[PDB]
Symmetry: C2
Subunit: 108 residues, 2 copies
């Protein structure tokens, strides 16, 4: 329960979870539901905010960098998988910018 992890939970996740573009990212990508049969062939390490939030809640992370990498993986999966012009990409980009803006003020 480090100062960094508390920041990532109370400031970063708090902001991202409730954001109006967060909804596609709140649970693991469901390739059946979304009709994406190639999703898991392209994306080998799925990640989502629900998984990250639960991990923060359950003291899963040993370091802040580990949580930061999970956020990063989530956004990166989105950019890699989707078409450049898909709305989801803009949504991720917007959430990622908040992530980085907040992480710039995180404890050391």
């Amino acid at each position: 329960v480090t100062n960094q992890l508390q920041y990532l939970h109370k400031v970063v996740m708090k902001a991202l979870w409730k954001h109006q573009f967060a909804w596609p990212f709140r649970q693991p990508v469901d390739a059946v539901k979304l009709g994406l049969p190639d999703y898991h062939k392209i994306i080998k390490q799925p990640m989502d905010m629900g998984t990250i939030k639960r991990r923060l809640e359950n003291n899963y992370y040993w370091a802040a960098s580990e949580c930061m990498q999970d956020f990063n993986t989530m956004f990166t999966n989105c950019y890699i998988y989707n078409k450049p012009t898909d709305d989801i990409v803009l949504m991720a980009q917007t959430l990622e910018k908040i992530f980085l803006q907040k992480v710039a003020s995180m404890p050391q």
Copy 2:
């Protein structure tokens, strides 16, 4: 600022010398690299050479602004390239170092 100094002398220095950094040290040259669709897909090109020059010329007002340019550079790479391209792995490797070093940045900006 103290954070901008850190981003320049600690974060950028370590990223710059990395064995996977060479594609990212200058703007994407779409003509030289034979990528005629690059600028039709990527509307905000960014690279470490541009960021480094901006740090050296005191372009940035806050660390967050510089960090956003790093993010754009990496995001551009993931958006433009095919999932299976080596450059994607190279960017991922560099971006992990970026996040690692950003975590250790002094928290209050001077």
